[PDB]
C-alpha cells in the first residue's frame, strides 16, 4: 500500500496544544444577537452558504454575514473553531460574531468587511511589484495558519479578498480548513479543480500544509504568465494530464513510485509521455514585464509533484523574489 508521509514542519502542533484547541466537536458555540444586524444586499451564494453585506446597527459598521446551508451546517463547529483559533492572525479574516438566522434556522457567521476589488480588474492591472507584495501578504496568512496546525485546503483567487485602495488582503472561506494530525488520512475532494495538488489527483490521502503551497503556486503562475487558469483541466483526470504536460511524466512517475501509489488505470489512454518544460516556455511579449529569474526560480520550488519537496510558507518568505518588497 501507500508509503506514509508527515509534514516536514509544524508536525506536532496539535499534539502539544490542549485537546480543547483541535477537538472542534467538543466546542460550545457562544451565540450572539441576530437583532444587531441588518442584511443590505446579497453578494452571492455557493453550495454551502449565502453571503451578504450587512450593517451592524450597534456601531454602524459594515460587516459580511455568511449564512450557512444545512450541508455546511453539520460541519460549522470545525469552521468556527478554526476561525476562533486564527482570530487576530495576519491577513486572516476576523470572525466578529455568530448568530442564529431566524429564516434559515442555521448559524450565520459575521465577519469584518473587506471592500473587495473585482478579480478581472485586479488580475488585469497588477504590476510586478503588486504581485510580489500581495503574494507576501498571502504567505503571512498561510505560515500563520500552518504554524497553528491548520491547513486551508481551498486556496484560490476567489478566497483572497483584496481592498486594493488600502492594500489590505484577507484569506477567507475556512469552510474546508482542517487540523493537521500526522498520519491522518484526509478527504481528497477538497480545493477547486485548477488549484488541486497532484497528491489529491492521485488519491494520496496523507497530505499536509504543503497542499496550500501547490495552490499558491497555481495562482502565481496564472498572474505572472497571464494564463487563467494555468493548469486548465476539463475534469480531475485531465487536470493531472495538464500538469504533466508542464512538469513531465518522468517526475510524475518518480513521485508515485516514491509513495508506492498506483495511478488509476484510466490514465493509460490519456496521460502519454511528456518531457519537463522549461518555465521560460511560458514567457512572451505580453507577460515579460511580470517575469524575472527570481519569479521563475520561486515558482519552480512551489510547483513540484512531491509535496515534501515544495517550499514551506516560511521558506517561501525568505525567497529572493520578495527582496524588492518593502518590509
Ligand atoms: N436567511 C436567508 C436564507 C434562507 C434559507 C437558507 C437555506 C436553508 C436551508 C437550505 C438551504 F439550501 C438554504 C439560507 Cl442559506 C439563507
Ligand atoms: N465588490 C463588492 C464586494 C464586497 C465584499 C465582498 C466580500 C465577500 C466575502 C467576504 C469579504 F471579506 C468580502 C465581495 Cl466578494 C465583494
Ligand atoms: N479575489 C481577487 C483576487 C485575489 C488574489 C489575487 C492574487 C493572486 C495571486 C497573486 C496576487 F498578487 C494576487 C488576485 Cl489577482 C485577485
Ligand atoms: N461577485 C462575484 C463573485 C462571486 C463568487 C465569488 C466566490 C466564489 C467562490 C468562493 C468564494 F469565497 C467567493 C467571488 Cl470572490 C466573487
Ligand atoms: N518563450 C520565449 C521567450 C521570450 C522572451 C523571453 C524574455 C523576455 C524578456 C526578457 C528576457 F530576457 C527574455 C523569454 Cl525568457 C522567453
Ligand atoms: N521583466 C523582464 C524580464 C523577463 C524575463 C527574464 C528572464 C529571462 C530568462 C530566464 C528567466 F528566468 C527570466 C528577464 Cl532576465 C527579464
Short mmCIF file of N, CA and C in Angstrom, two decimals, residues 220 224 279 291-304 311 319-321:
data_model
loop_
_atom_site.label_atom_id
_atom_site.label_comp_id
_atom_site.label_asym_id
_atom_site.label_seq_id
_atom_site.Cartn_x
_atom_site.Cartn_y
_atom_site.Cartn_z
N UNK A 220 0.15 32.05 -8.62
CA UNK A 220 1.33 32.79 -9.04
C UNK A 220 1.59 32.59 -10.55
N UNK A 224 1.67 35.70 -13.22
CA UNK A 224 2.91 36.12 -13.90
C UNK A 224 2.91 35.78 -15.38
N UNK A 279 10.46 26.73 -17.63
CA UNK A 279 9.48 27.77 -17.31
C UNK A 279 9.48 28.93 -18.30
N UNK A 291 7.61 38.81 -15.28
CA UNK A 291 8.52 37.72 -15.09
C UNK A 291 9.92 38.22 -14.79
N UNK A 292 10.69 37.42 -14.06
CA UNK A 292 12.08 37.65 -13.70
C UNK A 292 12.73 36.29 -13.39
N UNK A 293 14.06 36.19 -13.35
CA UNK A 293 14.71 34.93 -12.95
C UNK A 293 14.28 34.52 -11.53
N UNK A 294 14.10 35.49 -10.61
CA UNK A 294 13.66 35.17 -9.24
C UNK A 294 12.22 34.62 -9.24
N UNK A 295 11.31 35.20 -10.03
CA UNK A 295 9.92 34.68 -10.12
C UNK A 295 9.88 33.24 -10.57
N UNK A 296 10.67 32.93 -11.64
CA UNK A 296 10.70 31.57 -12.18
C UNK A 296 11.33 30.62 -11.22
N UNK A 297 12.39 31.03 -10.53
CA UNK A 297 13.01 30.11 -9.56
C UNK A 297 12.04 29.81 -8.40
N UNK A 298 11.34 30.84 -7.92
CA UNK A 298 10.35 30.70 -6.84
C UNK A 298 9.19 29.77 -7.30
N UNK A 299 8.68 29.99 -8.50
CA UNK A 299 7.56 29.18 -8.99
C UNK A 299 7.97 27.70 -9.10
N UNK A 300 9.20 27.49 -9.55
CA UNK A 300 9.75 26.16 -9.72
C UNK A 300 9.76 25.38 -8.39
N UNK A 301 9.99 26.08 -7.27
CA UNK A 301 10.08 25.48 -5.95
C UNK A 301 8.72 25.29 -5.28
N UNK A 302 7.63 25.88 -5.88
CA UNK A 302 6.27 25.63 -5.38
C UNK A 302 5.65 24.51 -6.17
N UNK A 303 5.79 24.60 -7.50
CA UNK A 303 5.10 23.63 -8.38
C UNK A 303 5.92 22.40 -8.60
N UNK A 304 5.98 21.60 -7.55
CA UNK A 304 6.69 20.32 -7.52
C UNK A 304 5.69 19.21 -7.22
N UNK A 311 8.54 24.34 -1.30
CA UNK A 311 8.87 25.31 -0.24
C UNK A 311 7.75 25.35 0.80
N UNK A 319 12.50 33.91 0.09
CA UNK A 319 12.99 33.85 -1.29
C UNK A 319 13.39 35.18 -1.86
N UNK A 320 14.47 35.21 -2.70
CA UNK A 320 14.86 36.46 -3.39
C UNK A 320 13.75 37.20 -4.15
N UNK A 321 12.68 36.49 -4.63
CA UNK A 321 11.58 37.16 -5.33
C UNK A 321 10.96 38.29 -4.43
#
